[PDB]
Design a protein around this ligand. Structure first.
Ligand SMILES: Nc1ncnc2c1ncn2[C@@H]1O[C@H](CSCC[C@H](N)C(=O)O)[C@@H](O)[C@H]1O
Ligand SMILES: Nc1ncnc2c1ncn2[C@@H]1O[C@H](CSCC[C@H](N)C(=O)O)[C@@H](O)[C@H]1O
Ligand SMILES: [Cl-]
Lengths: 321, 308
């Protein structure tokens, strides 16, 4: 019945917390070498004997742990993605959800009532892990972005608000004819340059320190805005599109990607939940639809635009000057 | 990919809070009389304009509201079961989750580390009550006592369903007012009585059948076995004890509701726990009951029955 599906979603915070706590505990990392019996896993996590078995078996019943003859083991997904120290480790996402996001969303009612953010504005190694996970998700968007656009038509690309440069680096690795410029605040420069040095791209990639609310954007054939316009109130986003249009040549493109809401605002749960995340986290940020963005790009003067799926929950709007 | 499913479970607290806040705001009760445009719904709920449309549309995307021409309406399920004031209302589970359980489960880590609790319905009991009345041949018995009866919903339904029965509700004295109200509502008169007491301090009422609905799981195992001993002492030869719980499956690898309930018991009680049918049958045999059986009762709730 539909009411059963609804109650299951409404009480989803419990199953959520089980996985979140397991990640915060590093439970899956303790099983990376091989299976462990219940008492050994409990002792390594320093859990009380009262509920350790229940906790482990809940993970088994949720499909994220295996158990055979009293010994628990990783599933293929947790061995691959929830083992700390591996290059593919995404557990930092869950670690940050457990440490911060879970309680932040506990203030949804007050954010909805006041319209005001409910995080630190209202009031160590987990940040590295979370940043590793962000770089991971960024890489997925970057792999798709490299294949979704005919990059042979362009010679230069500028990533606006590039952070550590993951998308830009992967783009230039997949398309060796491209030259790239990452644009971000000066404080981002060392993280970006460490990835630049690791990539071996050399002079093909540069960083420009800047504030995009106070100076022009680098000229390039393609400008990329990944998770940029959504952080700000709309007049500030339109300012950025004007600067993008001024930075581009004729036939150059702007690429905007976000966890966009579907145009009819009735299908895309992750995009709509992200709009609520922007409520809780920023003064004026917001998630939007592709159709919203196409209207802004038309106001800014772009000749044409289209919405296109990217990967995971991400999609993009591409416009031509 | 199974990893995409894992990540959807892990972040399920977001969609959960959307629904919980909706239920605590009575949003579906506001749409009970008819559809409303977003602004009118925003005004009636006292929500800020920044995010009201996002919130309403998330509920549409989750499939619990419908929207057309800018007007929102209940779905059939939310009109049938999430509208306050109706006897079928199931939203009390959601309201208490939003007020208490969401943040309580935020302390799951401390519970697991310390083993200590971290905390310091009539409709949902009615589904079990109806199933209990139909799953047991109550014509074989004359009297029934419900041990820890709360407001008496299950016992009242049994007596309404089987008019030959005489019933006794047993609970702490503080529960008696709420029992008396439901007893007065039922018109059952002399066929139903409340007995105040503490089942760890005094014997249980004698009856042909004793019912333990969501009792044993609240207590450490020695105390649960003590209750089964007292049930054996209170029953006649051929009498039955009826236990119902959201039992974990015997292999302890599939029943997510039962396993989550055991963690709920961790967070809420000093020594309670969820258990399996096989567990309960062993306890019943140790207590001297002749025979026992486990059957599904109603959705996630199962029943263990034993005969003296
Ligand atoms: N005023 C400003 N000028 C330049 N960059 C800014 C800025 N304000 C914020 N940023 C940058 O914008 C980025 C937003 S996070 C987005 C990072 C990346 N595009 C991705 O998709 O993962 C941050 O790296 C932040 O440093
Ligand atoms: N020591 C005690 N003596 C008698 N009743 C007790 C008790 N300790 C707890 N209880 C009762 O046990 C009940 C547990 S809640 C379960 C209520 C009911 N059987 C149902 O399924 O809905 C509460 O009503 C509480 O009042
Ligand atoms: Cl150029």
């Amino acid at each position: 019945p539909a009411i059963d599906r609804l109650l299951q979603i409404a009480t989803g915070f419990m199953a959520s917390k089980v996985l979140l706590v397991a990640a915060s505990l590093g439970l899956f990392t303790e099983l990376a070498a091989g299976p462990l019996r219940g008492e050994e896993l409990r002792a390594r996590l320093r859990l009380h004997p009262r509920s350790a078995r229940d906790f482990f078996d809940t993970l088994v019943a949720l499909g994220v742990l295996e158990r055979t003859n009293g010994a628990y083991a990783n599933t293929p997904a947790t061995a691959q993605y929830l083992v700390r120290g591996k290059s593919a480790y995404l557990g930092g996402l869950l670690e940050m959800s457990d440490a911060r996001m879970y309680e932040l969303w506990g203030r949804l009612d007050e954010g909805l009532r006041t319209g005001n953010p409910q995080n630190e504005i209202r009031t160590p190694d987990r940040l590295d892990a979370f940043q590793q996970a962000m770089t991971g998700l960024s890489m997925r968007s970057a792999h798709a972005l490299a294949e979704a656009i005919d990059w042979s038509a362009y010679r230069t690309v500028a990533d606006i608000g590039c952070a550590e440069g993951t998308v830009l680096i992967h783009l230039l690795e997949r398309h060796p004819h491209l030259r790239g410029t990452g644009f971000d605040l000066a404080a981002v420069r060392p993280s970006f340059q460490r990835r630049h040095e690791e990539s071996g791209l050399g002079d093909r990639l540069a960083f420009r320190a800047g504030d995009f609310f106070a100076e022009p954007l680098p000229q390039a054939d393609a400008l990329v805005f990944g998770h940029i316009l959504s952080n700000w109130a709309l007049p500030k986003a339109k300012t950025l599109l004007r600067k993008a249009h001024e930075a581009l040549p004729e036939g150059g493109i702007v690429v905007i990607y976000e966890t966009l809401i579907d145009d009819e605002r009735r299908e895309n749960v992750p995009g709509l939940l992200m709009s609520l995340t922007m409520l809780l986290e920023t003064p004026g940020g917001f998630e939007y639809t592709g159709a919203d963005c196409r209207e802004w790009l038309a106001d800014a003067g772009f000749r044409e635009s289209r919405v296109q799926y990217l990967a995971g929950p991400e999609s993009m709007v591409i416009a031509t000057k």
